[PDB]
C-alpha cells in the first residue's frame, strides 16, 4: 500500500513498485524489497526514484532494446502527474506513526 519515508544499497533489489498520484492523494512513494516468505519492503521517495531511472534510460539512449524506449515515456508523464506544489500546506506525516 502507501507508506512513510524514514531513514540497503542498490544491488540486492529485485522489484520496485510505484504508485500513481490517485493512490495516495498526490504523494509519490515507492517500495523496495528483496526476493513462509514474508517480504519486508523498504519504502522510498517516488520522485527521486522515478527521476533516478529516467536519467538512466536517457544516459543510455543507444542501448534501448525497444522495450525500454517505451518505459522512458511512461516514467515521464507520470513524473509530471505529481504536483510538487499544493504540498506546502499538506500534512507530510499522514502515514507516520512514531513509536
Amino acid at each position: 500500500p502507501c507508506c512513510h519515508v524514514t531513514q540497503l544499497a542498490l544491488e540486492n533489489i529485485s522489484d520496485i513498485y510505484l504508485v500513481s498520484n490517485q493512490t495516495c492523494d498526490g504523494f509519490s512513494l515507492a517500495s523496495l524489497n528483496s526476493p513462509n516468505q514474508l517480504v519486508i519492503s523498504r519504502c522510498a521517495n517516488g520522485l527521486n526514484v522515478v527521476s533516478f531511472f529516467i536519467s538512466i534510460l536517457k544516459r543510455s539512449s543507444s542501448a534501448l532494446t525497444g522495450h525500454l524506449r517505451e518505459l522512458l515515456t511512461t516514467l515521464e508523464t507520470l513524473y509530471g502527474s505529481f504536483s510538487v506544489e499544493d504540498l506546502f500546506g499538506a500534512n507530510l506525516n499522514r502515514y507516520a506513526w512514531h513509536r
Epitope: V39, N91, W97
Partner: antibody, heavy 115, light 113 residues
Framework: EVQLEQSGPELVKPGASVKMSCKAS????????ISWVKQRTGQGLEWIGE????????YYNEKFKGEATLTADKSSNTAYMQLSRLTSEDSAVYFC????????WGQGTSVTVSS | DIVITQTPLSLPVSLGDQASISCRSS???????????LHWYLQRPGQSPKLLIY???NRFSGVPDRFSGSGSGTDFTLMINRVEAEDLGVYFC?????????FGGGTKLEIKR
C-alpha cells in the same frame, strides 16, 4: 497484507512454562511491530507489549516484565513470547497483532492454568 | 495512564438501523502534528478482533462504506450506516500516542426485540 499464525493451546500447570509463537507471512514494511494483548473470557483488551524483530527494542508496561519477556527470530520472523510463574487470574487468550494500528491480528492462543 | 470511555456499554439495534459509538479520551490525541491516533476494532463473537478504522476516520482494507469515524481532539464517534448481521459483536477503541496504548470498554452491538 500480513497473515499470522499462533501456537496451539497449551494446558499448563501453575509454575510450568508456556511458549507461544507468532509467525508472520505476507507483505509489510521495514521496522514493523508485533503487539501482544490478552483478554479474559468476557473482559476487554489490556496491555500492549510491543517488539520489533529487526530492531529488537521492546516496550512493555508495569506488568509482563518478569511477568513476561519477548524474544524474536529474524530468520523466519516468529516473535516468541513465553511466561511461567503464572497465577489463576492470567488464564486468558493471548493475541498477536502486526502493525502500528494494529492492522492484522492472529487467531490467538488460549492457555488455561490450573493445578 | 490514559483512560478511555465508551458509551453505551450495550447498544441494541435492529437490522438496518444506525449505530453510534463514542470513545471519550482523557488526554489529547495529537502528535506530529494533527495525526490523531485513534483506532476502532470489531470482535465478532468467537473470532479474533480485527481493525475497522484507524487514525480517527480511515477505512481499513476490506471494510465496507457503512463504517465511518468522526470527531477529533478528545471526543470521537463511530457510525454504522444500516447495520448488517455480520456487524454484530464488540467494538473496542484504542490510542497509540502515549505508552501504554490502552483500549476501551466494549460496547456490545446486539439485536433488538
Amino acid at each position: 497484507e500480513v497473515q499470522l499464525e499462533q501456537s496451539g493451546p497449551e494446558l499448563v500447570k501453575p509454575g510450568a512454562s508456556v511458549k507461544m509463537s507468532c509467525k508472520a507471512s505476507g507483505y509489510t514494511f521495514t521496522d514493523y511491530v508485533i503487539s501482544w494483548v490478552k483478554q479474559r473470557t468476557g473482559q476487554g483488551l489490556e496491555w500492549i507489549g510491543e517488539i520489533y524483530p529487526e530492531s529488537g527494542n521492546t516496550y512493555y508496561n508495569e506488568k509482563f516484565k518478569g511477568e513476561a519477556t519477548l524474544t524474536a527470530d529474524k530468520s523466519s520472523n516468529t516473535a516468541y513470547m513465553q511466561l511461567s510463574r503464572l497465577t489463576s487470574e492470567d488464564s486468558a487468550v493471548y493475541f498477536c497483532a502486526e502493525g502500528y494500528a494494529m492492522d492484522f491480528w492472529g487467531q490467538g492462543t488460549s492457555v488455561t492454568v490450573s493445578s | 495512564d490514559i483512560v478511555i470511555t465508551q458509551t453505551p456499554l450495550s447498544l441494541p439495534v435492529s437490522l438496518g438501523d444506525q449505530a453510534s459509538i463514542s470513545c471519550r479520551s482523557s488526554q489529547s490525541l495529537l502528535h506530529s502534528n494533527g495525526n490523531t491516533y485513534l483506532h476502532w476494532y470489531l470482535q465478532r463473537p468467537g473470532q479474533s478482533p480485527k481493525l475497522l478504522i484507524y487514525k480517527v476516520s480511515n477505512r481499513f482494507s476490506g471494510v465496507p462504506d457503512r463504517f465511518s469515524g468522526s470527531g477529533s481532539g478528545t471526543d470521537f464517534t463511530l457510525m454504522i450506516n444500516r447495520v448488517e448481521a455480520e456487524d454484530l459483536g464488540v467494538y473496542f477503541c484504542s490510542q497509540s500516542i502515549h505508552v501504554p496504548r490502552t483500549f476501551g470498554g466494549g460496547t456490545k452491538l446486539e439485536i433488538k426485540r
